[PDB]
Amino acid sequence: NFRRAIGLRIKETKEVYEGEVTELTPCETENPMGGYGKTISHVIIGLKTAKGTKQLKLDPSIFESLQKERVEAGDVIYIEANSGAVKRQGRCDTYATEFDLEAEEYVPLPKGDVHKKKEIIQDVTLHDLDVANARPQGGQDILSMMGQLMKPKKTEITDKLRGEINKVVNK
C-alpha cells in the first residue's frame, strides 16, 4: 500500500501499420546476385483502411513471419512499427457473406490512415512495477506457463526488487 501511493506518469509514442491486406508482392531485383536463382529486395504489402489503400515496402524477412501466421489476401493485419512483428486479426468483414458458415470472427475494416501514430501518457504505480517484475506475464517459457496455470498469489517482495526498480525509475 505504501508503493501503490507513488505513481509514475510515463509517456511514449504508439505507432502501428494496419489494414485489409489487398496484396503481398515479394518484389524481385532485376537480376540475382552471383550464384543465385532469384533475390527479393523487399516485400510490398497492400494495406487498406476506410481512408484509403497504401503499399508498404518491407524487409524480405517479413515473409518468413507472414507464413508463420496464416496471412492471405483479404485478412486484416497489423505491424508494430517500433518492433516489426506482424500479427493477423482475421478475415475482413467485407468477406462475411462469402460462405453460410466459416470458422472465424470476421473483423470490421479499420478507419483512419494505414499508418497510425499517437503519443500516450500511461500512469503506473510503483506497485504495478513491483508485481510485473515479481510475476512476469511473458508467456512462452515453461515457468511462465506453470506460474500462470498455478493459483495466483501475493508474495513477500524483496527489498532488492524495490532497490532495482528505484535504480531504473531514477534513470
Partner: protein, 439 residues
C-alpha cells in the same frame, strides 16, 4: 525542478556520523549534531565493521524515544557507503507467512554478507555494416553466416558460429544497429541505430532515437563488480532456474544442505581469489518486536564465521519479552543482552535541539527568523523533537501560502494551534471523553 524517487524523508539530512580521522565526534558535521557519546561509540563499531576481521558482533543502541538511535544507525549506513551491504529490517518484518521466524532471520543475516565478484570479459562493440545468414534447402539444416562490424576508426568481418547465429536472429539485429556482444558468452546487446540510414530504408520495421557510431578499437574489455549477497547465492542454488525468486520473494525455508554447501564454496571462492566476501551490517530496528523464539535464534546464529555485524535499536524500559510474561531490560532476554555491547544515547540540550532544527531547515530549503527558531526550540523541548521537526514543513507551507520569503514566529504560533502535539490531543480527549470509543 524535477523530483526523483528518493525525496526529503525523516533522515535525509544525515550523511555520516561526523567523526574526524582520530575518531572524535565534531559538535555538528555530516548532518549529525550533539549526541557525542553514542556517535563516538558508533564510530568504533563502524571501524570494526569496515575492518571486517571478526564475525558474530552485536550492538544495541538504546535510550529515550526521539534521541537519535535511528539517526545514528541510518547515519553510519551513509558513512559505511553503498559498496558494503547494510540491511535495515524493522523487528516486525521477520513475521512471515512464506517462512518461519528463524528462516526470516537467517535470510536477514545472509542478505547482509556480500560476495563482491569482479567480472571482466572481452566485448565486441560496433555498428553492424552487414549480416549474411546462409540456410541449406533442407538437409541436416545447420545455418552458417558472416557479420561485418565498424567503428569510427576501424572495421572487420567475422565468420559466425551456429550459437551466435541463433542469438543474432533471435534479437533481430539488422544493418545499421549498434551492438555490444559479450565474446565470452554469445549474448548480444543493442544500443540503437546509427544515424546514417535515414536515406535508404523500408516502411518502418523499427523506431527509436538514434545513437552515435562507437569510437576507437572494435574489441574492448568490460569490467563489472557484483555485490551478490549470500542470501541471493542460496536462492540461486536452491533450485534450477531459481533466478526470479530473488525478486519475487517466493523461496521459503531453503535447505540447510544448500547453506552449508554455500558456506564451503564461498570460502573456496575467497581462497581461490575468485570473489571478495565482504561482511556487512544487519540493522534490526525496533528489535523489541522479536519473539523469544527469534531472540534464541539470535543467541546462536550470531556465532557462525558467516554472521554479519548486527546493530539493534530499542526505546523500551524494563518490559515483558514479546511472546512471554518475563520482564527484562530493553524487552530483550538476558541470553542475548549478555552477548552484545550497549551504546546509550542521551536527551538533547536547548543548544543541540536548536542546532538539529537549524540543520533540518538547511535540508528542507527553509529560511526562518532567529525569533522563529527560538520559539520552535522551546516547542521542541516542551513537546518532543519530532513534533518541532514536523512544524518546520507546515510553517514553511503556511508562509508560502501568505507569499512570505522567511518563516516568522507567528507562522509557527499559527501551525502550533493548527496541528496538535500528542500531549495536547491526549488532553482534549479528556473533555470529549464520552464521545470517543472504548476508553
Amino acid at each position: 525542478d524535477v523530483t526523483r524517487i528518493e525525496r526529503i524523508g525523516a533522515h535525509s539530512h544525515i550523511r555520516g556520523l561526523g567523526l574526524d580521522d582520530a575518531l572524535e565526534p565534531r559538535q555538528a558535521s555530516q548532518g549529525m549534531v550533539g549526541q557525542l557519546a553514542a556517535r563516538r561509540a558508533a564510530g568504533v563499531v563502524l571501524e570494526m565493521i569496515r575492518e571486517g576481521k571478526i564475525a558474530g558482533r552485536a550492538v544495541l543502541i538504546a535510550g529515550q524515544p526521539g534521541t537519535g538511535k535511528t539517526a545514528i544507525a541510518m547515519g553510519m549506513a551513509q558513512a559505511l557507503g553503498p559498496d558494503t551491504p547494510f540491511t535495515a529490517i524493522a523487528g516486525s518484518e521477520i513475521f512471515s507467512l512464506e517462512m518461519s521466524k528463524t528462516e526470516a532471520l537467517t535470510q536477514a543475516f545472509r542478505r547482509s554478507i556480500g560476495v563482491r565478484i569482479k567480472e571482466e570479459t572481452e566485448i565486441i562493440e560496433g555498428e553492424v555494416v552487414e549480416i549474411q545468414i546462409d540456410r541449406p534447402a533442407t538437409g541436416t539444416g545447420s545455418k552458417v553466416g558472416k557479420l561485418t562490424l565498424k567503428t569510427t576508426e576501424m572495421e572487420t568481418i567475422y565468420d559466425l558460429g551456429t550459437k551466435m547465429i541463433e542469438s543474432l536472429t533471435k534479437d533481430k539485429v539488422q544493418a545499421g544497429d549498434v551492438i555490444t556482444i559479450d565474446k565470452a558468452t554469445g549474448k548480444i546487446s543493442k544500443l540503437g541505430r546509427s544515424f546514417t540510414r535515414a536515406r535508404d530504408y523500408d516502411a518502418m520495421g523499427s523506431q527509436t532515437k538514434f545513437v552515435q557510431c562507437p569510437d576507437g578499437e572494435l574489441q574492448k574489455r568490460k569490467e563489472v563488480v557484483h555485490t551478490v549477497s549470500l542470501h541471493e547465492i542460496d536462492v540461486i542454488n536452491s533450485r534450477t532456474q531459481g533466478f526470479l525468486a530473488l525478486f519475487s520473494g517466493d523461496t521459503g525455508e531453503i535447505k540447510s544442505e544448500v547453506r552449508e554447501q554455500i558456506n564451503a564454496k564461498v570460502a573456496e571462492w575467497r581462497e581461490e581469489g575468485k570473489a571478495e566476501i565482504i561482511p556487512g551490517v544487519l540493522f534490526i530496528d525496533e528489535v523489541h518486536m522479536l519473539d523469544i523464539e527469534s531472540f534464541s535464534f539470535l543467541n546462536r546464529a550470531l556465532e557462525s564465521d558467516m554472521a554479519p555485524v548486527l546493530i539493534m535499536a530499542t526505546n523500551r524500559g524494563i518490559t515483558r519479552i514479546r511472546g512471554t510474561s518475563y520482564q527484562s531490560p530493553h524487552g530483550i532476554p538476558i541470553d542475548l543482552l549478555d552477548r552484545l555491547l550497549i551504546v546509550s544515547t542521551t536527551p538533547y540540550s536547548e543548544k543541540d535541539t536548536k542546532q538539529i532544527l537549524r540543520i533540518r531547515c538547511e535540508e528542507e530549503d527553509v529560511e526562518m527568523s532567529e525569533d522563529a527558531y527560538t520559539v520552535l526550540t522551546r516547542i521542541g523541548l516542551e513537546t518532543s523533537l519530532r513534533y518541532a521537526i514536523q512544524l518546520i514543513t507546515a510553517a514553511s507551507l503556511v508562509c508560502r501560502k501568505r507569499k512570505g520569503t522567511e518563516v516568522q514566529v507567528d507562522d509557527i504560533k499559527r501551525v502550533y494551534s493548527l496541528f496538535l502535539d500528542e500531549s495536547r490531543s491526549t488532553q482534549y480527549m479528556k473533555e470529549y471523553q464520552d464521545a470517543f470509543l472504548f476508553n
